Amino acid sequence: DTMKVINDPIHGHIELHPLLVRIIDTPQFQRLRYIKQLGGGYYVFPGASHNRFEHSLGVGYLAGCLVHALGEKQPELQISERDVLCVQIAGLCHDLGHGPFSHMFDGRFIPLARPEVKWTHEQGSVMMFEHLINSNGIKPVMEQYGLIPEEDIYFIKEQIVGPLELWPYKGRPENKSFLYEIVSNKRNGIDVDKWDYFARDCHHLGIQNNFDYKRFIKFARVCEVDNELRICARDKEVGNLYDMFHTRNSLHRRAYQHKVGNIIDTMITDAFLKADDYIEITGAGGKKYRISTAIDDMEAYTKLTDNIFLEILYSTDPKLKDAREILKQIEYRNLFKYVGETQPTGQIKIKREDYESLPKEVASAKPKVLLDVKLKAEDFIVDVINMDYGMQEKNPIDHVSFYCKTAPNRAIRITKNQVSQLLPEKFAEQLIRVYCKKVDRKSLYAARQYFVQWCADRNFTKPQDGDVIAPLITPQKKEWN
Amino acid sequence: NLYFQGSQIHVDTMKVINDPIHGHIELHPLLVRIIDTPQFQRLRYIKQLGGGYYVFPGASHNRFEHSLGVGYLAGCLVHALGEKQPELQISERDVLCVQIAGLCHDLGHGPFSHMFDGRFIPLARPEVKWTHEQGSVMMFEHLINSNGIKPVMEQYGLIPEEDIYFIKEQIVGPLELWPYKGRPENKSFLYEIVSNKRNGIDVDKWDYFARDCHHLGIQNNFDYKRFIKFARVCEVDNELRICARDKEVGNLYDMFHTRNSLHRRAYQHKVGNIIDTMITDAFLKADDYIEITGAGGKKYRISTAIDDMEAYTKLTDNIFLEILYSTDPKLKDAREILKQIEYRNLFKYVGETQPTGQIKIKREDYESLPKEVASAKPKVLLDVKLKAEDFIVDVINMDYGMQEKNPIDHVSFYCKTAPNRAIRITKNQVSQLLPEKFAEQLIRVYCKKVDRKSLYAARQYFVQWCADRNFTKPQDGDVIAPLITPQKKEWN
Amino acid sequence: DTMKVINDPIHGHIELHPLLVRIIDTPQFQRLRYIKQLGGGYYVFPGASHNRFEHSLGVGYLAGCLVHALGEKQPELQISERDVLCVQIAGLCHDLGHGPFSHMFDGRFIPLARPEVKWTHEQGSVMMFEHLINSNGIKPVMEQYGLIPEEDIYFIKEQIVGPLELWPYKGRPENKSFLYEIVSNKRNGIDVDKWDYFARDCHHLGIQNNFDYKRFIKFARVCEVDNELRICARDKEVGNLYDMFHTRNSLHRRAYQHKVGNIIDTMITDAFLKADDYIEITGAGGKKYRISTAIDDMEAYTKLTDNIFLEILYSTDPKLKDAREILKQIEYRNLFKYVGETQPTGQIKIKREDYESLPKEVASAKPKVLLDVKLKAEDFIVDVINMDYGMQEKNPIDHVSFYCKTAPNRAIRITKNQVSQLLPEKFAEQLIRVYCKKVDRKSLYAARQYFVQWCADRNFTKPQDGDVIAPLITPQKKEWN
Amino acid sequence: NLYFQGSQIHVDTMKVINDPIHGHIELHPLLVRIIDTPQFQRLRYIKQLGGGYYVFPGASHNRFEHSLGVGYLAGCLVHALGEKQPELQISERDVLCVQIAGLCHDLGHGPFSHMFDGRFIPLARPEVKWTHEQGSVMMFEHLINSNGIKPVMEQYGLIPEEDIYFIKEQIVGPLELWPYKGRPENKSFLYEIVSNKRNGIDVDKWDYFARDCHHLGIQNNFDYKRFIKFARVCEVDNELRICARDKEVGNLYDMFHTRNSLHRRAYQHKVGNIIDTMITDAFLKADDYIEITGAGGKKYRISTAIDDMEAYTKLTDNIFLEILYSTDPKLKDAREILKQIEYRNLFKYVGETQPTGQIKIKREDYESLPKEVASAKPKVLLDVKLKAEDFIVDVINMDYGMQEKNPIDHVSFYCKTAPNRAIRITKNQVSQLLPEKFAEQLIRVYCKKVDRKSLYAARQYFVQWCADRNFTKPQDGDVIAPLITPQKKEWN
Ligand SMILES: Cc1cn([C@H]2C[C@H](O)[C@@H](COP(=O)(O)OP(=O)(O)OP(=O)(O)O)O2)c(=O)[nH]c1=O
Ligand SMILES: Cc1cn([C@H]2C[C@H](O)[C@@H](COP(=O)(O)OP(=O)(O)OP(=O)(O)O)O2)c(=O)[nH]c1=O
Ligand SMILES: Cc1cn([C@H]2C[C@H](O)[C@@H](COP(=O)(O)OP(=O)(O)OP(=O)(O)O)O2)c(=O)[nH]c1=O
Ligand SMILES: [Mg+2]
Ligand SMILES: [Mg+2]
Ligand SMILES: [Mg+2]
Numbered sequence A, C: 001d002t003m004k005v006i007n008d009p010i011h012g013h014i015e016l017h018p019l020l021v022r023i024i025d026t027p028q029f030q031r032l033r034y035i036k037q038l039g040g041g042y043y044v045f046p047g048a049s050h051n052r053f054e055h056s057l058g059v060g061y062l063a064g065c066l067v068h069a070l071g072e073k074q075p076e077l078q079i080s081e082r083d084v085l086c087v088q089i090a091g092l093c094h095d096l097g098h099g100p101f102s103h104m105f106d107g108r109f110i111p112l113a114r115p116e117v118k119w120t121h122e123q124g125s126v127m128m129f130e131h132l133i134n135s136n137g138i139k140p141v142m143e144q145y146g147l148i149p150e151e152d153i154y155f156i157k158e159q160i161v162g163p164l165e166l167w168p169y170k171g172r173p174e175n176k177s178f179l180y181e182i183v184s185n186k187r188n189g190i191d192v193d194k195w196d197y198f199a200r201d202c203h204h205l206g207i208q209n210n211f212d213y214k215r216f217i218k219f220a221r222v223c224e225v226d227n228e229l230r231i232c233a234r235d236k237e238v239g240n241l242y243d244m245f246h247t248r249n250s251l252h253r254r255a256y257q258h259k260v261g262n263i264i265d266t267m268i269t270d271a272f273l274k275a276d277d278y279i280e281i282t283g284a285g286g287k288k289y290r291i292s293t294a295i296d297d298m299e300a301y302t303k304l305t306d307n308i309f310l311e312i313l314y315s316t317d318p319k320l321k322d323a324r325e326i327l328k329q330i331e332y333r334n335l336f337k338y339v340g341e342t343q344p345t346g347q348i349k350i351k352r353e354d355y356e357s358l359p360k361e362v363a364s365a366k367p368k369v370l371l372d373v374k375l376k377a378e379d380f381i382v383d384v385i386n387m388d389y390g391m392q393e394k395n396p397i398d399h400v401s402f403y404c405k406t407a408p409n410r411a412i413r414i415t416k417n418q419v420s421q422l423l424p425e426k427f428a429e430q431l432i433r434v435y436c437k438k439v440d441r442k443s444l445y446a447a448r449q450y451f452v453q454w455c456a457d458r459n460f461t462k463p464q465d466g467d468v469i470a471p472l473i474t475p476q477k478k479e480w481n
Numbered sequence B, D: 001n002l003y004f005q006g007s008q009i010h011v012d013t014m015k016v017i018n019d020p021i022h023g024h025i026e027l028h029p030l031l032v033r034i035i036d037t038p039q040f041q042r043l044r045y046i047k048q049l050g051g052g053y054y055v056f057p058g059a060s061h062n063r064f065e066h067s068l069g070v071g072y073l074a075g076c077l078v079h080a081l082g083e084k085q086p087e088l089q090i091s092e093r094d095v096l097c098v099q100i101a102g103l104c105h106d107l108g109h110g111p112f113s114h115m116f117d118g119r120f121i122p123l124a125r126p127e128v129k130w131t132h133e134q135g136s137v138m139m140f141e142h143l144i145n146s147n148g149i150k151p152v153m154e155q156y157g158l159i160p161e162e163d164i165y166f167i168k169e170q171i172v173g174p175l176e177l178w179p180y181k182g183r184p185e186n187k188s189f190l191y192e193i194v195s196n197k198r199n200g201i202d203v204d205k206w207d208y209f210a211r212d213c214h215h216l217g218i219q220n221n222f223d224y225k226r227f228i229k230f231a232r233v234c235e236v237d238n239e240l241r242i243c244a245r246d247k248e249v250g251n252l253y254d255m256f257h258t259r260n261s262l263h264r265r266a267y268q269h270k271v272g273n274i275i276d277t278m279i280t281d282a283f284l285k286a287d288d289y290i291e292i293t294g295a296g297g298k299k300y301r302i303s304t305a306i307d308d309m310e311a312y313t314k315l316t317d318n319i320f321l322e323i324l325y326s327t328d329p330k331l332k333d334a335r336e337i338l339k340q341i342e343y344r345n346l347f348k349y350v351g352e353t354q355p356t357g358q359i360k361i362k363r364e365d366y367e368s369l370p371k372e373v374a375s376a377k378p379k380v381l382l383d384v385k386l387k388a389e390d391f392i393v394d395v396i397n398m399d400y401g402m403q404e405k406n407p408i409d410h411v412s413f414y415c416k417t418a419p420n421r422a423i424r425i426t427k428n429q430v431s432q433l434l435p436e437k438f439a440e441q442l443i444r445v446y447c448k449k450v451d452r453k454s455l456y457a458a459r460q461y462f463v464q465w466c467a468d469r470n471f472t473k474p475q476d477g478d479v480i481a482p483l484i485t486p487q488k489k490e491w492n
């Protein structure tokens, strides 16, 4: 067995270690070829046809690059080729648990289809990685290349999902704590996963990337913080670090939370919900599963990809008529109409408990205008969007450690006061989008009146087009003055 | 509610779409209407490079986005010709018609694009003659009638029965002296924009060069925007034709060189081709058992779906996964081939060779070549005997788009001093470093037996075959078959 | 006379109208080939060898692109090919007044060499444009292409420098107000000049551009605001507008105000000051000028470019020995040492009046530590840097007008409350950098103690490396806790 | 103050530099020390493409940044060969030596790079033989001695008198059977990295392809990182040499095709060449009057500055502006030529042609060609008579880097199955679409009289000359000289 060279448009010519190849060339991994990275985003950005597969190769490659560089500069860290492999494997396998249309699946569909469960793609990756290992006889191949399967398998899973439960990790000790920061960084969100998707999503979307990951690597060291050896950034790179998160927020703002992309995700989810009772997926021992229950059997889940969208679209079964008809509305570009957007004021926070109650509120607003139609709760969609720097209210830079030129082994902290007064004052906010399922001109005009009135009643921000969409409603609120 | 010169101002707003290749593009509402149909959206589910994605992981792009690009570039080119030369009388109607043909040129592609009409249909239904271009005509007709497009066309100044006919001609060529009916000789240049049958210079290439490169990780060296700036329309015979600036002839040869490089590096990749072959095999073994419902509830096969546009609408890359995920025991053989692809247990590449001098392998004889390889008698002591059925012999025609011909012999040029005067430039006049010939054949051989002993044997059979046929010495000949190469001293 | 096609790496193949060619092909314009865009930046970023010339072609091209697009979409605006040309010419000629090393010249050198005068490159461009016109017989060529020289020349100058003095402009009336917003936008800083330099500087620097000017153009319209027809942006592009200014700030932060690039500018300026009495530049009627007085004669100024740096470096004249020796220190990379950086706290603002007094303050600090050397005022450089969004304390978006999808001819305003709580709270700040001209280890150690002590005394922010460079000084200040 | 295994940990910090082409690069302190000298910084003031900047406005890049890139790539290549093959015994000392040669290969370039040793010196001082490469040796020596580099070299494990000699050999080739002294035969591959005299495959090209393209606005199609991954060291004869993977032979031919394209589009641009010519003319007319102070206060001319490295250090593109800004009446003629450049009053291009068959124009005879053109007798009624001195005849040798030879005939390959075994691949074995020849000549003619009547006349003289000499028909022949082309029916 020898290495393969593979050409990636983002990273160029990459070397794949035979062990990685062996993992790659399985039904469980190849599955990621059939799941779009940005889900419904492709229906708004025609370049975004890329799949989780190629992203996963990139993460695996970057993970190895970062670990290798840290090792070359600091042999005292005792990074072995075994460690490198383990980090590469976790990089490759971090996304094994994604379902159809990626985040649509665990973000929208599963919570609606099966509210009793708690499911994340990351948990799925653990289960799928286990399934991949056992079904393909990977352990002996691991041993052949110097890995210790029981330790390292556990290590790999920890890197993907976090602690499986004081130093909470078992796969590696405190003096290799930095190995847990590479693929998925739970402490501050600085990891190679972002680095790949920034570059790859940008290449495909037609938006240019502004973050330089290679610079970051050159300015990265490992320093003692408490009893852990941790990744530290050069002090004067703090500005570039804030920009990294700004880039993340810009991508979510422009692309990942696109108002129409979100509506397409919603519509696809609706179709899936209406198909869920009637579609059968065969899993372990011939047992049958639904779209919503395929997550319980990794054999069935292996066969659950974006294909499901087309199985529904091409179906003839009269019981799939409702599902099929929603997908056809997507093809004819007869989508739910966007009504507007607003935000909470001050420190008001919309709780997820209450998301379900918001369409009723909008429908219950009493705009003092002449209308030709009355709209019901079910005619409205209210999509609440949490935009943040990856750690809710928190500033990630408060959880980053730095080093100075004069003392490169000494970890320090940098506070927000010490950086720049032009930075954000807060690190989380909510965006509220409202849509209407009734698409004619009269319903849309009405929806707008209900919406702006709702905004006024709730003391939400004045919609940007408020004076134009609801001129009779906006004077009423002099806070909007 | 604003007025200018006493007339009301009407604001028409176009849809803007962001393409990574072309940037922000404006789509005319008529184009949008055509785009937003099941017949056009279908192209979202057919990969541009087919099996190429299984070798180049960036190549996940679909025919859909390529089609938007062709449509956009077609409009860009026509518009530019018009701005520079009003005397050509290019109308906004002409522009639209060329854009539409650009959008719709690929409507007829099937699963994995060229795999389908290039490999599968010829094997599954040898009696028929099918091309994706014909499919595009049928599919365009089906798109038009099923979505009530004609009145929308009329609304924007088009004359449907003229223009529909025009659009089809642009896509497939003449439908039966000046052979075209959609437009006359003095708009001959409109037929050169989307699909150029005379010399292969068209916007379709311009899009795929750039788009394929962006996705593949190979950099594009052709500059289409430069070409447009150096393009004019000049009288050639009695036709008004697109002419290139004389000193751009070097760049023109390079355009075709880029095309050949892309075929060489990517489109004809030895492993990409084997994956296409394997997928085709799976399809052939599934063709009796898969049902696709078309017009009036009629059932069709993968191979017969091309006869009904309603069924064909539902025939995309999905078929690969339908086969892969199937449980039906009758699909077991098909399914098993696709599983071998997933486990990367592929047919092994044995080697490559070419014919010598000007010998040409006739397509008639392709089928007889595996028997020849198996019938070779290599003087090597072997552990296995291989049969005809163990070998695949893939003959590849590499050329400049016009068989033996030099496309530049069919290009017309203009000079700075007389920009309305068309001239010819011969190969003698340009550069002695250019190719002497414009077509060749590459012969690849593979073995379906994948173990080490069979592969070693296959190599001996292969190189022996090459020696017997007076083919070129394989590049790795002395290493893969050291006992076989000395016999042939032409190979010294 | 025919058009030329020119290939620019940024904009691709561009068409140049013969009138533009005629202006381009003069000593006054070709001069810009010998003045680096980023001045001393090239000595930090080796890709930044680009000159004002190519930037000027780009601005001229983009100016035409923007005006043409506005015209195609809105014929009611009555944009003529004459207007297009006038805007292209102003774009080409906006930078004619730059001196050696661009902003170094009017930003550093002239204020030190001739404090009594008030000089800006923009004024220089006006003078140089006039000189270009008269010396090359451009007026009849202008007339040949439908321009009216007395009107249009005046128009062009207004576009470059602003009002030459209620509607304050004479070259065009209120209903073409939008033509003044294209090359140099004094109202809100949204103009094609930025658009070119973002892209061009990025291409050369090795930093990726994140702003999409072509998108902006597609979402731009002209709408009535007061009595003026003004450029308006689509409402939902407000997020992208804030990002435009963020990109500007990032470029200044990373590149244009690089701590070492600024020191090289300083050193070059010092050399120029020490050479200014001895270098002769021949101007109009054979009269002699200095580097500092060449700005008074456009004929002499025409011959004043980056060449001056090499004339000094290659000189043998003993009177240039001091000047020459500073440039040699640059070549040997014996530069002034960076000591650290800090900022003012709260709403404190350092006035430019006081900049000169700051080195004395630093030298007068009394750090309670053992030192081997005493440093004087003249050993310190204190570089105060104003970082802002282009309009001092102001938010440029408060001076932008928008339009909505439903009413594309209706101008509206969008306030900061209506956008995003993750945006900056303030739009200006100051950065204070300190350097030491004594380069040995003992002086640098001392300089650091003086500096951090100075920061403590002034209630400035704790330097990022404060605890490492001056561990004995930082505990003292518990505000830094 | 941290310890591991009981020994103190020492943190060495490298300088990081950001290059737009290569990204963030690490510079070893020894390299920094060499970089930060007047001799090296000088390269900041010499444009890579000389007069090319006056045609391609992006091409403002200087030799400095190119030199950093070559040095970086040289290290990248050596490092990669070493990682894959430890048996080669590549040391960090070897790495440094190759990096240094990479950095310093261009130290000898003069004003406007190739204009200087290619045009000016041969005209200004015909008795001498001068190349920039020789200059680099002299300048490297001067850099070393003037800046006390040897002890710094020793400090980092180098052996100065061996390694200095090695570095010079890498730059200029052999300094007087195995002809090299700096390293033995089993490190022969180290001589192939910076400047490859055997087949032209080296990192110098790799940098300039990418860097020139980035600046010019022409896109690069060669992938150097791919090449590195497919490169090995194999025994060829008794030398260890760099070998390419067999199936990369297609990409290798394309590498040289890219080189030829760049020369064709950019480096030999018909107007760029005329600007080089005009600048050279100015320099020639200034050469008697400009003084450059060198070692011990001695005075030198532009043409004699090459004899003293101290003077030469001060000879850069600055000379162009010194001439342009001068007031001395003795520089009036020189100054006036440069002013014509600024006003874009350039010598007019007349046309281009080539020799036929395998006729070769000898360099001896270049000087006699303008007389020939002026002596042609075109049967056209003209308003002016042109003289020899009114014509410029620029003969351009276009080739694959080794005159008539195919570089691929001098490349060694390895196969997948036997990666330590060097083999040869012949042209027959690869592709019949490749060039038949590897060298040719282009003849450009210009006229120093710029008015409309002289230019019309020049064209008649030129095409007539072409007919008389049996040269190829100019591409615009029938348009520029319609009365002249019929006479020659070989041109039909
Ligand atoms: C041939 C070729 C492949 N590629 C891509 C496709 C793959 O992603 C990657 C490696 O492809 P190849 O080098 O073609 O890999 P292979 O496995 O076919 O070769 P072998 O087993 O004989 O060594 O490079 C290029 O980018 N350029 C090229 O010229
Ligand atoms: C919001 C946004 C979209 N896009 C892409 C997605 C699409 O391909 C294209 C158009 O996006 P939008 O301008 O968002 O189009 P829309 O139809 O959602 O807006 P509206 O109907 O309100 O006018 O641009 C960007 O490139 N950048 C951006 O910032
Ligand atoms: C600050 C900065 C510099 N650069 C470039 C400029 C240089 O070419 C290279 C190195 O810049 P710096 O890292 O700023 O180097 P420095 O020598 O100024 O810093 P120090 O001595 O404090 O370690 O990177 C960036 O590309 N991006 C950035 O954000
Ligand atoms: Mg392989
Ligand atoms: Mg829309
Ligand atoms: Mg010209």
Ligand SMILES: [Mg+2]
Pocket (backbone or CB within 6 Å): none
């Ligand atoms: Mg530094």
